[PDB]
């Protein structure tokens, strides 16, 4: 019905310094910078002379103002991505063959093998500014660091989406590497 206003205001804290610039948002904190654009959604983004930032849509129809409540939630991920970081975890369930995953320097991509006793040495790269080292302190666990949530998660679903068992059953051949913990890196303890 082309309703008039639906604006959200992200609550910027004290430690991080943001800037919307004509729509692109560059937020600087502890762990780095996450300069990302929204030159496609076409809101009216605005830091009202304060710390905070407010998106605002005028006369968008119904689908348009659904996308207000996401860009105010993309931003507060790029808040947490630079003060606490984004870290997933992998657990690598298997039945009979131990999935001998490895990575190294540099070779902070990955190099996993013995799925499922196949000779195909599967190799999964990582998104930039994002590293994989194998998790210590645990049997067959992994750690994907990084600040951008989608460059953590999307780079940590490639290790999940292959390996998958092809051409067989999947409700009995339950092997693979799956995500167990989607955590921060710092807050509050880790």
């Amino acid at each position: 019905m082309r309703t008039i206003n639906s604006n959200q205001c992200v609550k910027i804290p004290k430690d991080i310094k943001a800037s919307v610039k004509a729509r692109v948002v560059t937020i600087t904190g502890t762990r780095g910078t996450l300069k990302r654009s929204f030159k496609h959604l076409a809101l009216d983004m605005y830091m009202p002379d304060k710390r905070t930032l407010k998106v605002e849509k005028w006369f968008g129809t119904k689908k348009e103002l659904a996308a207000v409540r996401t860009v105010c939630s993309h931003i507060e991920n790029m808040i947490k991505g630079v003060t606490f970081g984004f870290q997933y975890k992998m657990r690598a369930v298997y039945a009979h063959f131990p999935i001998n995953c490895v990575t190294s320097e540099n070779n902070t991509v990955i190099e996993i093998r013995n799925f499922l006793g196949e000779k195909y040495i599967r190799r999964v790269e990582m998104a930039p500014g994002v590293t994989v080292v194998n998790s210590t302190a645990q049997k067959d666990e992994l750690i994907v660091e990084g600040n951008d949530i989608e460059s953590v998660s999307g780079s940590a679903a490639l290790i999940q989406q292959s390996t998958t068992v092809k051409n067989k059953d999947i409700r009995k051949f339950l092997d693979g590497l799956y995500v167990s913990e989607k955590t921060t890196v710092v807050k509050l303890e880790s």
């Binding site: 019905m1 309703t3 008039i4 206003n5 005028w58 006369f59």
Partner: protein, 173 residues
């Protein structure tokens, strides 16, 4: 057209077993004088016996609503025929003039439901004050102070030069 408003009055011409037959009146929105006088009979061939000529049209007049610069929000009652589907409705518009918010109905009812205007009947039209308007697209146009910075023109495309020289940079801020 723009659907002026009339008040059209009937007679049942007075044959001798009953003189003075009892003078019914209507409220008609039609584009013109004479089509108002033939909505009247289509809407007399449902309520009274009474056709032409068994009846007359005693004085009609076009009426010129009362406050043409007040910002009243109308609420019209309606009856309309679908493809299969004669249905009641109840619709609401904001307009200064009553016949401007019946013609606001027609061009909206005709668009949104395909509703060709011979299968729409007006069965009440009244001004509805506020806090009775239901219709969400009305009652967002209520709250003074209403800020609403829709930087709006038509932004005439393009201007007096077809092969212009200047690249019109809409926003201008």
């Amino acid at each position: 057209g723009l659907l002026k408003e009339y008040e059209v009055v009937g007679r049942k011409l007075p044959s001798e077993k009953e003189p003075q037959t009892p003078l019914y009146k209507m409220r008609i929105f039609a584009p013109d004088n004479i089509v108002a006088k033939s909505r009247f009979w289509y809407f007399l061939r449902q309520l009274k016996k009474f056709k032409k000529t068994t009846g007359e049209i005693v004085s009609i007049k076009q009426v010129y609503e009362t406050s043409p610069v007040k910002i009243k929000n109308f609420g019209i009652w309606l009856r309309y025929d679908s493809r299969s589907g004669t249905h009641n409705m109840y619709r609401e518009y904001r307009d200064l003039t009553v016949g401007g918010a019946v013609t606001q109905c027609y061009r909206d009812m005709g668009a949104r439901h395909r509703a060709r205007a011979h299968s729409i009947q007006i069965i009440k039209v009244d001004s509805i004050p506020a806090a009775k308007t239901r219709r969400v697209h009305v009652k967002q146009f209520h709250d003074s102070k209403i800020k609403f910075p829709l930087v709006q023109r038509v932004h005439h495309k393009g201007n007096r030069k077809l092969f212009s020289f200047r690249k019109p940079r809409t926003y201008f801020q």
